[PDB]
Amino acid sequence: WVPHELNERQMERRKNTCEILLSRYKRKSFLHRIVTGDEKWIFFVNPKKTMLCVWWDQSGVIYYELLKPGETVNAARYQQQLINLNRALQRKRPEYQKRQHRVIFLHDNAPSHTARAVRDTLETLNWEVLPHAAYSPDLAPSDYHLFASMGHALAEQRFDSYESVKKWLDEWFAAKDDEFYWRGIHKLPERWEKCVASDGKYFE
């Protein structure tokens, strides 16, 4: 529940990561090459919880998976998600199909995200892996933008089935404007800047 108290180590990593990303961004914006993703539990009551695993960029959702009740993302499933995500990017993002742009990948450091096999796949796919700070959902567009917007809408839902969840998810992602996804990604520099100006603390 209540807000994690950052320690010195944590605030130092945040501040320093934000400085590095912000000075890079000022040299040359890279925001349009960011693909980012995160997992979120969705709860339904049967006549239970599924994990939503979703990846997106400034043009919209690229790929997602709703995992079967109770089941979880471990190192092996995540590696398989990335391989599928890549197949979906190739189909939905011609810029990358044509390898005229390298993907910049923004995910958190959940353990399944840094297992040996996942690291290997990431190198093979050869996406640039952006550094991500400990305890920083305020710097993760999936959390501060996508799932923040989604959680509100989901509050009013009482899902009946795994497949209702899926139905609701399809409509919800589609009814969002292109410019909704773009704003989510393009808010990053403002947040990196707030984070530097707080010295790595959480911010307003």
Add this chain to the structure above:
Amino acid sequence: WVPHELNERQMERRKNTCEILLSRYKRKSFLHRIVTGDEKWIFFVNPKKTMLCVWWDQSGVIYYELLKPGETVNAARYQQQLINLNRALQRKRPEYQKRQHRVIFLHDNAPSHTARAVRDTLETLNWEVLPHAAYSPDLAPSDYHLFASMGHALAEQRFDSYESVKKWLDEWFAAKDDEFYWRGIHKLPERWEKCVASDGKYFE
């Protein structure tokens, strides 16, 4: 942001507070005498933030104050809120006007809530002060029920003025059903029970 990690002290206080409240509740339910309250920041953009201070029971909102932009609740203002809250209870809750029931008061231990002057006023008013655990919004009906429901609705708002906030607040509190407030309060024992069964941890 991300969820406070409870330490041993904290989980012990939660577990033990919940045991005490739950065995009392099983001996004789006292839930209908609970008046509870909390503060929440509401943000508006002028052509800024106000603190909502609100108190309620199972029949609805009793009293609230929206403080002027940036201003804060210190020991002296809180004492003055309680005196006003009491005037409002007397007007809106005849059971208590007629002193056939003692108020059970549920608030957190923010420092302004435990200043010397506030403690004195609480004794004078003679409300029973329920023990409240450190870092326990999951056990505070204002947080898990009232402000959880409100935050969603507020997400869609872009307030223009202190007085829009106030207008929205009046309508919002009034459009809630009686049974909405009742459920908020009457969910307590379930939560105390979850908290005991987690041994003082946060729960699902």
